[PDB]
């Protein structure tokens, strides 16, 4: 597992890793496709607080 950050949520933390991709066409040099990430701990953490 690794840490994943997104710019529209600057105060969250994610855990997951790459799982699979999607097929791409071999007839062009401009490609649109997607891949899937698998998060097994399904919760979204925040900053650390020590009290």
């Amino acid at each position: 597992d690794v840490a994943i950050y997104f710019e529209d949520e600057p105060t969250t933390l994610y855990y997951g890793r790459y799982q699979s991709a999607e097929s791409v066409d071999g007839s062009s040099n401009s490609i649109i496709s997607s891949f899937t990430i698998f998060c097994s701990d399904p919760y979204k953490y925040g900053s650390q607080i020590v009290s």
Binding site: G26, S27, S28, N29
Partner: protein, 166 residues
């Protein structure tokens, strides 16, 4: 050079089963007909550019004329449509003539097919009109065809005197 007129192209018909009894006849009062050919082009995209794969030939045929009084061949075409028999079609061009071994012949093309449409709309102020469509097998063949004297000329009068005809 000289342009080519569309009035020099005519059509001939004959039912297949009567090929050993009669010669092809000409349908009277023809106005226009349409002949078209096309192929379906399938395009596959590669990193170099489109590459085209061609398919078979599709024929599109149609005819139009004016029904004449006392003409028996329309009945033949109607019967052929009813019983679904084969029909022969000749497309003869009168502006081209043969040179060496075909002195009295014109360029033509040969087809066979069925009849798949037979329509007529009579109104109260016009003349009767007929429209026919065909479905064609195989590929048309090329060659040279023969036209008789009475089917290649137009009839007109000549000078006459001013005395009583005896």
């Amino acid at each position: 050079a000289e342009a080519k007129k569309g009035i020099d192209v005519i059509l001939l018909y004959r039912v297949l089963k009567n090929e050993a009894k009669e010669a092809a006849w000409k349908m009277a009062f023809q106005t226009e007909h349409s002949n078209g050919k096309s192929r379906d082009a399938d395009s596959t995209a590669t990193k170099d550019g489109p590459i085209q794969n061609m398919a078979a030939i599709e024929y599109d045929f149609s005819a139009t004329s004016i029904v004449a009084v006392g003409d028996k061949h329309i009945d033949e075409l109607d019967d052929a449509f009813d019983n679904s028999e084969l029909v022969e079609i000749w497309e003869i061009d009168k502006a081209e003539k043969g040179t060496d071994k075909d002195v009295d012949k014109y360029k033509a093309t040969y087809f066979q097919g069925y009849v798949s449409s037979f329509s007529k709309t009579p109104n109260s102020e016009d003349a009767l009109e007929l429209e026919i469509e065909f479905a064609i097998n195989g590929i048309g063949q090329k060659g040279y065809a023969t036209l008789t004297t009475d089917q290649a000329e137009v009839v007109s009068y000549v000078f006459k005197d001013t005395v009583k005809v005896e």
